[PDB]
Amino acid sequence: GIPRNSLEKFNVDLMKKAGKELGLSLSPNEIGCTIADLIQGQYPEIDSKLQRGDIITKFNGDALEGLPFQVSYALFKGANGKVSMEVTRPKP
Amino acid sequence: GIPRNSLEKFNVDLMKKAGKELGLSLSPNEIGCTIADLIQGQYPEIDSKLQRGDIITKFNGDALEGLPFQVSYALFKGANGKVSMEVTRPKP
Amino acid sequence: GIPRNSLEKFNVDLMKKAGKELGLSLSPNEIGCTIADLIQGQYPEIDSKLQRGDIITKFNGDALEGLPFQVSYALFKGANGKVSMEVTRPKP
Amino acid sequence: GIPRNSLEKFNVDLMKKAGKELGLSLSPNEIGCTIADLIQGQYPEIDSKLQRGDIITKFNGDALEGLPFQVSYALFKGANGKVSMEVTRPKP
Amino acid sequence: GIPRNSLEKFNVDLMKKAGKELGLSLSPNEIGCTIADLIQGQYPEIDSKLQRGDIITKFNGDALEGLPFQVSYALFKGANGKVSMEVTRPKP
Amino acid sequence: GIPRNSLEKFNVDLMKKAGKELGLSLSPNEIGCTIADLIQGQYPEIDSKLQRGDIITKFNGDALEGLPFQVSYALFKGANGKVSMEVTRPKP
């Protein structure tokens, strides 16, 4: 199936100061976790970089492609301290 | 891939009184059907328990994980009488 | 898993006059690409036929079922001239 | 991904008998169940029409594409008498 | 899709030794890794309990269902000593 | 899921000849096509470099990861001359 490309990525790094739900509502797919909701974030990173529909493809170094949601969800839930995410905006 | 957990679930039971689209717009994924739209439901259950982005993981006893959407869609379409759903809210 | 059906489809044909993002924000799944966003389209077709949550199942003749998003995304990105899409509205 | 073929299918029909296993070890995949191994001498129809590597795509009327192995396996295990399968030999 | 069985699991335990490969060729699938081929004579436990076509579903405590093969394979490759597997024999 | 390896790849190159089948029975999976079975004696390069269980991951320049088998199979079937494959031997 010849045509195949990138999916340009951008980073979103934040500090997980306990007492905060990242605010991200997620949806699992083959390439990562789709953002369903983003209640006006609490990280300049999320607020000025993320939007509904964006797909988080890597979390703290772990590629999310192909991972069962039970695994990816656990990764997000265990976020403590410096959180770093790679994201792609699927708008051809 | 060590970290792996639950996905806490909650139930939504309603009475399928003919003449009503459940109002649920769906999206298929590996763990179930994602709710795309929920036009102000017509079941105290849906209205006070469901939101866009929630994932229905079981319908009338049939687990939706891994099912082709052609199958899950048919299950919803054939809903008649007591409808019972297990749902998870993917917000780490 | 006995129950299995159709997914009625409808078409959306437009003219790709350069200088326009189709405006479609996409989400990959097993049957096609889910529309995440549809900024008030620029094609009578998209504006009067598409809505958030709809799933594009075929693009210019290529069925999108089972295709890696890296492939489908590339197909949309390379759209030039007469664009034809088959879509399904997942509302049981 | 342009090239996409419809696969050739042949039929295998037999009558299961108590105490006589089908003798097929199955491996699930997106289009059906691959015969990972088979014991010759169980049923004449299997010996005459099936070979290691063949992929069973329909079992007693139910299409196996996309089904979780827990469902496909249940279908095979639940057949006490008539067995009708559609199969493809994946040897390009 | 109503019929859906919980698969029978058996345990295989061994102590890996330097210079002695497990001798198993693996094929990934949704529930685990199918033993596509195996060389007899490597480990007594494999010779006594495993056969071509068996599907390894858990490896040293990690469930293999849904894992990308790049992860499952890494788990197998990383075992230098104790190996504990859960396995199912898919022969309906 | 932390552990995730990049798999070792080797090349297989041959010139297909009319009347001489490749002799490979393929089984689709997420990373490519497993050689479920193969008939020795067809091509010297296959006899010298391939074995049952090997997984073909690229065919004549097209990566096979994630492709529907209907597409991968079409690629193999469409090769009338030069055949260049990338392959991995999944034996941890």
UniProtKB/Swiss-Prot annotation, chains A, B, C, D, E, F:
Expressed in photoreceptor cells (R cells) of the compound eyes and ocelli. The modification Phosphoserine is found at S25, S27. It is found in: Cell projection, Rhabdomere. Signal peptide: none annotated. Second PDZ domain is a type I PDZ domain that tethers type I PDZ ligand inaC by interaction with its C-terminus. Involved in the negative feedback regulation of the light-activated signaling cascade in photoreceptors through a calcium-mediated process. Interacts with tetrapeptide ligand located in C-terminal sequence of 3 key components of the visual cascade, tethering them and forming a macromolecular signaling phototransduction complex. Interacts with the C-terminus of trp, and with norpA and inaC to form the inaD signaling complex. Interacts with Fkbp59, which together with trpl, rhodopsin and calmodulin may also be part of the inaD complex. This is Inactivation-no-after-potential D protein. It comes from Drosophila melanogaster. The lineage of its organism: Eukaryota, Metazoa, Ecdysozoa, Arthropoda, Hexapoda. The gene is inaD. The chain holds residues 580 to 665 of 674 of the full protein.
